[PDB]
PDB file of C-alpha atoms in Angstrom:
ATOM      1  CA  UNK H   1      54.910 -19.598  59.154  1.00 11.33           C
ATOM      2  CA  UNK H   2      53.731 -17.564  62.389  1.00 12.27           C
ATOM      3  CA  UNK H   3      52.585 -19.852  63.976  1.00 10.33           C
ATOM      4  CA  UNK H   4      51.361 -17.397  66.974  1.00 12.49           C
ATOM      5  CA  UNK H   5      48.356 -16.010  65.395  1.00 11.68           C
ATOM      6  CA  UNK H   6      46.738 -19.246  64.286  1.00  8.67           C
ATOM      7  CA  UNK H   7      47.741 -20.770  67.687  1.00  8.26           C
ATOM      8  CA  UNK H   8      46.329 -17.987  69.861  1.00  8.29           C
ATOM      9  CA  UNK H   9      42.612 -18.002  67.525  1.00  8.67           C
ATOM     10  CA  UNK H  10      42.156 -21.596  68.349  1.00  4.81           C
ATOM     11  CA  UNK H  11      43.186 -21.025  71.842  1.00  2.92           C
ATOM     12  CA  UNK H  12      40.527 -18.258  72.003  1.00  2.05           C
ATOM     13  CA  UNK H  13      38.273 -21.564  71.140  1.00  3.41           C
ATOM     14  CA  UNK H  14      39.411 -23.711  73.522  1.00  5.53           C
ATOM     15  CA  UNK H  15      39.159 -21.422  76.368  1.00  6.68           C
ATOM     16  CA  UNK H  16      35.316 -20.866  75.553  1.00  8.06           C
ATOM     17  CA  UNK H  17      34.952 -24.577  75.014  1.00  6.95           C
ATOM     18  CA  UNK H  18      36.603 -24.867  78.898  1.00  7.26           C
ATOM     19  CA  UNK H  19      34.239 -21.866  80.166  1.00  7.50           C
ATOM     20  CA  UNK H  20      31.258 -23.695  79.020  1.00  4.83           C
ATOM     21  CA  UNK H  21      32.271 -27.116  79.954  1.00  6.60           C
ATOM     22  CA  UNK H  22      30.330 -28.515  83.720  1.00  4.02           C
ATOM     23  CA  UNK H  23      31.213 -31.595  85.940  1.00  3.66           C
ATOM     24  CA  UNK H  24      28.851 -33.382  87.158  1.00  6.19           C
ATOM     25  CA  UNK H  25      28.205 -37.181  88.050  1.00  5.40           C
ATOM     26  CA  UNK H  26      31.223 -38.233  87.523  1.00  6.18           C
ATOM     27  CA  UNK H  27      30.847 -37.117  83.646  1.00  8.18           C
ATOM     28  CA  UNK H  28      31.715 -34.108  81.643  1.00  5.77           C
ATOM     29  CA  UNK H  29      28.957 -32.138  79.759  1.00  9.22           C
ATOM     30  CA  UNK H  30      30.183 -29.987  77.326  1.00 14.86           C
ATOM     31  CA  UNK H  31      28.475 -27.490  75.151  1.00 15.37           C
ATOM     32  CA  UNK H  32      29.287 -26.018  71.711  1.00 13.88           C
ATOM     33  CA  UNK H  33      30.184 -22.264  71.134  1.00 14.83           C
ATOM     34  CA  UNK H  34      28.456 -20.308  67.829  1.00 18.65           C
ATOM     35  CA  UNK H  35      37.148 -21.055  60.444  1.00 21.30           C
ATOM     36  CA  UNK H  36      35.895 -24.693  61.220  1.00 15.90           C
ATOM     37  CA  UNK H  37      37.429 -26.194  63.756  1.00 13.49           C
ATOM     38  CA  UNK H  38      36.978 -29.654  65.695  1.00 16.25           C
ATOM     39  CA  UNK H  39      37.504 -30.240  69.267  1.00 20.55           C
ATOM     40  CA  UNK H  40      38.807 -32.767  71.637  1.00 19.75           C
ATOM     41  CA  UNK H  41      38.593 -33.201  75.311  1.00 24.18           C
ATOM     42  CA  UNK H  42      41.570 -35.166  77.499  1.00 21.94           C
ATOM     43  CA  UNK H  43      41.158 -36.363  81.466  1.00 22.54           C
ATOM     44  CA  UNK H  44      43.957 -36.048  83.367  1.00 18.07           C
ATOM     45  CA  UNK H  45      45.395 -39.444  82.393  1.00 14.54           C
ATOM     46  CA  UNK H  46      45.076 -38.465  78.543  1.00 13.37           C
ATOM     47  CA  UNK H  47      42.077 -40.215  78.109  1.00 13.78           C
ATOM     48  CA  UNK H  48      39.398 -38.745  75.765  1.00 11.38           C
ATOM     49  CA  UNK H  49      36.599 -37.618  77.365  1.00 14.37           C
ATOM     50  CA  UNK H  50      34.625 -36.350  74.418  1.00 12.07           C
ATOM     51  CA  UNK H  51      35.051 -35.659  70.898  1.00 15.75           C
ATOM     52  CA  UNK H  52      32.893 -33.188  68.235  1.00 16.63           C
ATOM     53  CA  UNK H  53      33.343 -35.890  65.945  1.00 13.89           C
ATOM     54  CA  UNK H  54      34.609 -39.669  65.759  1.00 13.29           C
ATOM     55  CA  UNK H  55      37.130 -39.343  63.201  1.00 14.23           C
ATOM     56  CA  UNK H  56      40.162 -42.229  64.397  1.00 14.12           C
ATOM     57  CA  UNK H  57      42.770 -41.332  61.883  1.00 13.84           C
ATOM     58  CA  UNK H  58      42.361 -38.026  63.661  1.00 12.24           C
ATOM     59  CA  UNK H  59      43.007 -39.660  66.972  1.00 13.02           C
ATOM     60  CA  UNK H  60      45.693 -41.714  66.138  1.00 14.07           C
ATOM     61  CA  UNK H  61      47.754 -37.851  65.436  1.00 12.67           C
ATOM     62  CA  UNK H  62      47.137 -36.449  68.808  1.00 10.92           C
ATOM     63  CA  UNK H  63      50.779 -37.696  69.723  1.00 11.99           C
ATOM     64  CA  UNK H  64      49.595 -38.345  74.244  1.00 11.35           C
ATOM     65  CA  UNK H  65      52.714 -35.888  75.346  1.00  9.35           C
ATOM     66  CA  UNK H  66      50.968 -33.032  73.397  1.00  9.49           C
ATOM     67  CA  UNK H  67      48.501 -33.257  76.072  1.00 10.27           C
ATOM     68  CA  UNK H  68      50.364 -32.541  79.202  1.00 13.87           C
ATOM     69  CA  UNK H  69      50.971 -28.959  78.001  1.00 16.93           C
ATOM     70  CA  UNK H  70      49.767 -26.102  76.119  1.00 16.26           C
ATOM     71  CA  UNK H  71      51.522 -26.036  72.502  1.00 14.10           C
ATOM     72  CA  UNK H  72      51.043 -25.410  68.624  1.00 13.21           C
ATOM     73  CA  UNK H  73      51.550 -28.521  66.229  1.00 15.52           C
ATOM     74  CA  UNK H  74      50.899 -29.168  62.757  1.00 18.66           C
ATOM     75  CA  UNK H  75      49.919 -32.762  61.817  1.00 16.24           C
ATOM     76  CA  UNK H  76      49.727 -33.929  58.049  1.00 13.74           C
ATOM     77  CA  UNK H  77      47.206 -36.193  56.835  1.00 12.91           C
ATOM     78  CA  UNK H  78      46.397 -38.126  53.434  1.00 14.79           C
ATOM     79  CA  UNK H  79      43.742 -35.749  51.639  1.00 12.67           C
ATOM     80  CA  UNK H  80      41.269 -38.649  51.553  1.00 13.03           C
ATOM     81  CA  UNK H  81      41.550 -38.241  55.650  1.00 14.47           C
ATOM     82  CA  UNK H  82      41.356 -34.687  55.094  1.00 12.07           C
ATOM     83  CA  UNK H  83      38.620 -35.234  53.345  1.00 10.67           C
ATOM     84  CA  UNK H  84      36.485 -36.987  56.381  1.00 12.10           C
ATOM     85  CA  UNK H  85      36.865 -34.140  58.530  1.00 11.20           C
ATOM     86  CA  UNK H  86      34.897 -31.642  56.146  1.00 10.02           C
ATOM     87  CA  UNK H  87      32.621 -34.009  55.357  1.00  9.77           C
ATOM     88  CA  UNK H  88      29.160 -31.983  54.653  1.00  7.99           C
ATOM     89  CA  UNK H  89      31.220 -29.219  53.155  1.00 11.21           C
ATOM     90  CA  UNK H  90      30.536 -29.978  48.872  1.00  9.70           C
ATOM     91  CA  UNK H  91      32.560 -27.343  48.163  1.00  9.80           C
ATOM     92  CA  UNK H  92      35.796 -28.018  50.154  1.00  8.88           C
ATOM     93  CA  UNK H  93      35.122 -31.954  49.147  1.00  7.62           C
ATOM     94  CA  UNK H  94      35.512 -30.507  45.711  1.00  6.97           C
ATOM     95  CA  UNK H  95      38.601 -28.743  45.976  1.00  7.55           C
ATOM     96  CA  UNK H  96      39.577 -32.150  47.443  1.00  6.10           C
ATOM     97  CA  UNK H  97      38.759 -33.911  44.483  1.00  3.12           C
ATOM     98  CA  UNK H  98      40.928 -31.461  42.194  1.00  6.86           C
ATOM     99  CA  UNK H  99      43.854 -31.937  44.477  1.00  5.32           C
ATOM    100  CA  UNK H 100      42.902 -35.568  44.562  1.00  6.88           C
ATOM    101  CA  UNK H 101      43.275 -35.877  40.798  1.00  6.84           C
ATOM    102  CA  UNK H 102      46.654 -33.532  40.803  1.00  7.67           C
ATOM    103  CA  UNK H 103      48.356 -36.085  42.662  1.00  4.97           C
ATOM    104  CA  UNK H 104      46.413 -39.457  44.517  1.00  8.70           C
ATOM    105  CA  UNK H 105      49.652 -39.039  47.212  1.00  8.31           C
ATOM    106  CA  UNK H 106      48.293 -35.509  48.058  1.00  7.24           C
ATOM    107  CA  UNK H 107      48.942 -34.180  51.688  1.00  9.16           C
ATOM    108  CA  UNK H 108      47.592 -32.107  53.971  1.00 11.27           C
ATOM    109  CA  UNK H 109      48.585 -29.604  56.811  1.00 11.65           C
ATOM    110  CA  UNK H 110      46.154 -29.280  59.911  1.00 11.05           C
ATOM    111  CA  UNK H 111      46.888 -26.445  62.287  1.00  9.24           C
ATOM    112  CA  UNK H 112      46.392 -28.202  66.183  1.00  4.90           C
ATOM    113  CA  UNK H 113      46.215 -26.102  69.207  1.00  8.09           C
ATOM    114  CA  UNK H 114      46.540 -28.229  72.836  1.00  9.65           C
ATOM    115  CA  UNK H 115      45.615 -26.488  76.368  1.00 13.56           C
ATOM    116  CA  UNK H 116      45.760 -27.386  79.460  1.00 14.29           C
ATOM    117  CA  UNK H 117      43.780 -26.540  82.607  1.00 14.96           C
ATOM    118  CA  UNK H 118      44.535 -27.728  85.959  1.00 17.34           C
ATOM    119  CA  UNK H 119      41.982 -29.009  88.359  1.00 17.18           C
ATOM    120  CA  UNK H 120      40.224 -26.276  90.199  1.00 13.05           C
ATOM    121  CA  UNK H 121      37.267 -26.905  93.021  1.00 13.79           C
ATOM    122  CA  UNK H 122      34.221 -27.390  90.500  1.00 13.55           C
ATOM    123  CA  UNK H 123      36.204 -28.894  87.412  1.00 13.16           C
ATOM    124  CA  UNK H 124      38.710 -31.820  87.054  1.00 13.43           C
ATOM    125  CA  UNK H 125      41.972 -30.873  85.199  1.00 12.21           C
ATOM    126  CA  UNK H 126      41.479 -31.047  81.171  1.00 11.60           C
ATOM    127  CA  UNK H 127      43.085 -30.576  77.779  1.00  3.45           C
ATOM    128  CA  UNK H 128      41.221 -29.376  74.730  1.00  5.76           C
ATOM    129  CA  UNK H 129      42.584 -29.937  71.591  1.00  8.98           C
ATOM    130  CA  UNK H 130      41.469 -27.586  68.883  1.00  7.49           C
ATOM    131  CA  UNK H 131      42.240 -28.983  65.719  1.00  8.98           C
ATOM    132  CA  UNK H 132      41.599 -26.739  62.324  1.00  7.71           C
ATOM    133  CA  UNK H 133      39.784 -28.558  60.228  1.00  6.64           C
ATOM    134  CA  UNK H 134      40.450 -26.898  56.528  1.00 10.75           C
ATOM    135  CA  UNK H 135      44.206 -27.589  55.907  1.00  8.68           C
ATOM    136  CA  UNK H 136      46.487 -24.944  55.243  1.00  9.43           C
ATOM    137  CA  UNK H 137      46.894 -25.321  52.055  1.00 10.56           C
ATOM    138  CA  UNK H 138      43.661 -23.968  50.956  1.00  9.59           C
ATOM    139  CA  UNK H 139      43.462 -21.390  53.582  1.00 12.81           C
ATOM    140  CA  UNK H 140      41.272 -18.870  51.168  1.00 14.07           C
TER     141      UNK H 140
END
């Protein structure tokens, strides 16, 4: 599509996620901002330091190269996966349900934003992954 508008909103996200993020104790504290979106945090080494939600599926797609530079990416996903990261939503699980029942082989597009921010003196160097978690297809 353009992809630079959706890429730069959940940029916007991550760099508020970063701004409110503190090191201490060898262990990063992070603390939520106030559409849905769901983020991941990287070390250095491409390890995850934290995670919104535990959602593996979801893990497994966050290709490691992605996260030693800033970049847009789409990943699709099987619409019962879809399905697990708008869990709560009864709504959006019931649009699921009607694509479910259009086709059981249904996929989905998820809009991913990675960032990277080098080291500085108060903050080891990160990557947040902002990951958009209503696919593209029903944008509404």
């Amino acid at each position: 599509s353009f992809d630079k508008t959706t890429f730069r909103l959940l940029r916007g996200e991550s760099n508020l996620f970063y701004t409110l993020a503190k090191w201490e104790n060898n262990k990063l504290h992070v603390e939520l901002p106030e559409s849905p979106t769901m983020t991941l945090i990287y070390d250095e080494n491409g390890q995850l330091l934290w995670a919104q939600r535990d959602v593996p599926w979801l893990m497994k797609m966050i290709q490691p190269d992605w996260l030693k530079s800033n970049g847009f990416h789409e990943i699709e996903a099987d619409v019962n996966d879809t399905s697990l990261l708008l869990s709560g939503d009864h709504s959006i699980q019931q649009q699921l349900q009607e694509v479910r029942e259009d086709d059981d082989d249904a996929e989905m597009t998820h809009s991913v934003a990675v960032n990277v921010y080098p080291a500085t003196s108060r903050m080891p160097k990160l990557t947040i992954v902002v990951v958009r978690t209503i696919p593209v297809e029903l944008k509404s």
